[PDB]
């Protein structure tokens, strides 16, 4: 089997991407944030505290003839940005772009943090990291991908995120029309439960490439590119007037600037992030200070190849017995 679904930016900045997901019988379609940095499929639901729901579409398990309470199971998750959610668990039929999994754990939120409430466009998350990170207790549950894997034509999914435009998540096949040149594959460590890999270096604008190993995670659920402070300083030093602002929470730059590109290495290959991808706009409405899309990972404890990086590439998440990651230009 295969699946193919369009993923759409939630706003004009590509702060996140939502993908329609069919849950239950008859189908209830929710727009979920596909997140290769976590491993829970959780939704706003009829069980979510009413004051914490503000415009989201909810899953109502009592209206699904295929829903079953997973008795005794609970979940609770906290994300790198300080947001969180928790609740109980149902199993139900879940379909993405024509690919159907029966018996998928659908984690129903009883509580969500304010960041989730305030984002009316995201109805929940669909985790695509390794199932070892799934938070369901006392019986850990598998991700949608893990459940689908054996049925897929090939045990892969691909992320093709758009810049200020829709893109695609495919399951079970590689669309050879969706990228240019060849795909370069690189080793993955699953030891921390992430799609963790090592970039071979970087360049700023038309500058020379610096060969240096940068361990980090491919994370579709993180907006920005978080890299070591040395790398980030070298980038922003090429933008007149750019500075790190402790009050704003990262590098800012004059909105009048033209940003240089940023290149990262994948083996001997190179992925170029255009300068425009690195512009996240005014820090507040009407400001002439703009927020940068490359930020320091210092104090995160890990480097994160988030959407800023991934949307410059066609990315293969290869879930074969020994997982790997592939990157192509597009």
UniProtKB/Swiss-Prot annotation:
It catalyses: Hydrolysis of proteins with specificity similar to that of pepsin A, prefers hydrophobic residues at P1 and P1', but does not cleave 14-Ala-|-Leu-15 in the B chain of insulin or Z-Glu-Tyr. Clots milk. Disulfide bonds join 255-290. GO terms for molecular function: aspartic-type endopeptidase activity. GO terms for biological process: proteolysis. It comes from the Eukaryota. Its EC number is 3.4.23.22. Belongs to the peptidase A1 family. This is Endothiapepsin. It comes from Cryphonectria parasitica.
């Amino acid at each position: 089997s295969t699946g193919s679904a369009t993923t759409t930016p939630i706003d004009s900045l590509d702060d996140a991407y939502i993908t329609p997901v069919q849950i239950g019988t008859p189908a209830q379609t929710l727009n979920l944030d596909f997140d290769t940095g976590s491993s829970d499929l959780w939704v706003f639901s009829s069980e979510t505290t009413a004051s914490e729901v503000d415009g989201q579409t909810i899953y109502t398990p009592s209206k699904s003839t295929t829903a079953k309470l997973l008795s005794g199971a609970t979940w609770s998750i906290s994300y790198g940005d300080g947001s969180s959610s928790s609740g109980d668990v149902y199993t139900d039929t879940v379909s993405v772009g024509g690919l159907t999994v029966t018996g998928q754990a659908v984690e129903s939120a009883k509580k969500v943090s304010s960041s989730f409430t305030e984002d009316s466009t995201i109805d929940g998350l669909l985790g695509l990291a390794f199932s070892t990170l799934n938070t369901v207790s006392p019986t850990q549950q598998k991700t949608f991908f893990d459940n689908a894997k054996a049925s897929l034509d090939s045990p892969v999914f691909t992320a093709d995120l758009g810049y200020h435009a829709p893109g695609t998540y495919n399951f079970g096949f590689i669309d050879t029309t969706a990228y240019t040149g060849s795909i370069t594959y690189t080793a993955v460590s699953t030891k921390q439960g992430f799609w963790e890999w090592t970039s071979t270096g970087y360049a700023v604008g038309s500058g020379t490439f610096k060969s240096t190993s940068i361990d980090g995670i491919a994370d579709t659920g993180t907006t920005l590119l978080y890299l070591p402070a040395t790398v980030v300083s070298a980038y922003w030093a090429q933008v007149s007037g750019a500075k790190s602002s402790s009050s704003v929470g990262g590098y800012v730059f004059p909105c009048s600037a033209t940003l240089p590109s940023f290149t990262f290495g994948v083996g001997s290959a190179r992925i170029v992030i255009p300068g425009d991808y690195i512009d996240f706009g005014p820090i507040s409405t009407g400001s002439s200070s703009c927020f940068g899309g490359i930020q320091s990972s210092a104090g995160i404890g890990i480097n994160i190849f988030g959407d800023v990086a991934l949307k410059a590439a066609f990315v293969v998440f290869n879930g074969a017995t020994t997982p790997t990651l592939g990157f192509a230009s597009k």
